[PDB]
Design a protein around this ligand. Structure first.
Ligand SMILES: NC[C@H](O)CC[C@H](N)C(=O)O
Ligand SMILES: NC[C@H](O)CC[C@H](N)C(=O)O
Lengths: 291, 291
């Protein structure tokens, strides 16, 4: 169901590290304006890790309050604790979220069976649509294809954000599923292919700075028009790259700063994009005509 | 300054998942009797991840209580949020812990400067001996040896638990430091060796089930008695592989239960040891002469 360009929105902040609400609001209007099809409130890009449970909720609320049921809101509710995860996902449901995005427990390295029990428990406790998120590189674990298929077997588990970048792998998964649950790309670099291979959209980082372009690439990629997917994606490829020259979302948050859309806020352990990649990013933004 | 066999103690649980204060005290009293030099309260092996801040504090509290100041107690105060890490570290300092172990921020993948700043911030915020902890495999990040050496400059940043298993790298660190801060092995398998090369001890998983044996091994390798370290390690060198047949602390918590010391308690996303590894471990234990 949820399709298109789904931007994983940053959580704008002030120089001191407090959430920047006036700037958060403006960004939601701007995505809805620009053609963004949905939004993940407080995902990895949203500095979920450095936000308190209250800020997590406040943001989820604000994004839902400014969206005003105009486009669906997916609430970031992952945790490396099953219990903790149930608490954020219910909070989300109560706040009126359309769906929840739960990354695989990071750092405690659960077994594949633990990964199965973890999600099932969450699925049977809060009646909300749930979208799994696999990004081994960050978590320390890797939700196998077979595990994903066992889970698509659960009422409430409706999709899986796939950030491997491993396309044929992503393809195997989409095929094995036969439409039982959605798949979205969690890798901007190869999202156009994944969607061209039948993925329901991209939970995009690049979409923070180029929402129109992206939703256009998504539309035509889900539409199965190979050449336009390539042709329009190519206009923004350089961006999928330069936005990870440092850990996401260090750069995109600097990208948005150069765009004049947010202040330089970012919570430690994260840091402002290193002075070294600031001209390199500034040009890439100019080559793409975003400024 | 704290040296020898340092056990990352498990956090015993009842079938329902709540802490087993009865058994926890027994294990603390039994590690002291066996020869364990220090305990790490609520670290990875102790499920810091699935215990609330309330429980996190209760456990450091109880372990500090029962030890009665007979051995030093290190508190696992790590978090991937700087502000949070500071709160966890403060509570430890208030509870009366001797030092604090802080795994590098996990999952948000900070830059090396981010790592430097993060720890620099905790050191200046809390007046307490601190022990860095690097385990790329679970965090998605790698505290470079050069960042570690930079960080050794900071007054109360007094050591680093290297879990890489990368011995050459390990010695190169021990060398560069020239005593600026203590180095511990975060890897049982190669600990005996790292210690022969200058390391101040092992923050050991195996010490959970073979405290006396590890205690023996730590001492002799700290004495630089090569053959002895080697000969004693052998007694247990196979237990270093079996305790990780699944994600630590999954195997270890079983062993302790097989040793009739704790109940089957373990929190999701983690699970009881998979049946296919139960006999194998039992016989590895029996071999070692533990059961
Ligand atoms: N308070 C919100 C929540 O902590 C954010 C999740 C973050 N990854 C963490 O476990 O710290
Ligand atoms: N102390 C509660 C806190 O949520 C612990 C979870 C944290 N992600 C950890 O690895 O320790």
């Amino acid at each position: 169901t949820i399709q298109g360009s789904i931007v994983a929105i940053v959580t704008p902040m002030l120089k001191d590290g407090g959430v920047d609400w006036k700037s958060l609001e403006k960004l939601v209007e701007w995505h809805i304006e620009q053609g963004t099809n949905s939004i993940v409130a407080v995902g990895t890009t949203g500095e979920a890790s450095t936000l308190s449970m209250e800020e997590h909720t406040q943001v989820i609320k604000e994004i839902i309050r400014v969206a005003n049921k105009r486009i669906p809101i997916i609430a970031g509710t992952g945790a490396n604790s099953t219990r903790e995860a149930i608490e954020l996902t219910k909070a989300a449901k109560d706040l009126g979220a359309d769906a929840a995005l739960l990354v695989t427990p990071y750092y405690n390295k659960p077994t594949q069976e633990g990964l199965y029990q973890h999600y099932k428990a969450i699925a049977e406790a809060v009646e909300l649509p749930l979208i799994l998120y696999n990004v081994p590189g960050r978590t320390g674990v890797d939700l196998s294809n077979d595990t994903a298929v066992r889970l698509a077997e659960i009422p409430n588990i409706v999709g899986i954000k796939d950030a491997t970048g491993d396309v044929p792998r992503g393809k195997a998964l989409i095929d094995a599923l036969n439409g039982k649950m959605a798949v979205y790309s969690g890798d901007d670099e190869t999202a156009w292919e994944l969607m061209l291979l039948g993925a329901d959209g991209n939970i995009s980082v690049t979409a923070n700075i180029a929402p129109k372009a992206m939703s256009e690439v998504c539309a035509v990629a889900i539409a199965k028009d190979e050449q336009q997917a390539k042709t329009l994606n190519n206009k923004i490829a350089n961006l999928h790259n330069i936005l990870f020259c440092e850990s996401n979302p260090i750069p995109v948050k600097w990208a948005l700063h150069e765009m004049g859309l947010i202040d330089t806020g970012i919570r430690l352990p994260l840091t402002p994009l290193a002075e070294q990649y600031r001209e390199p990013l500034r040009n890439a933004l100019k080559d793409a005509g975003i400024i």
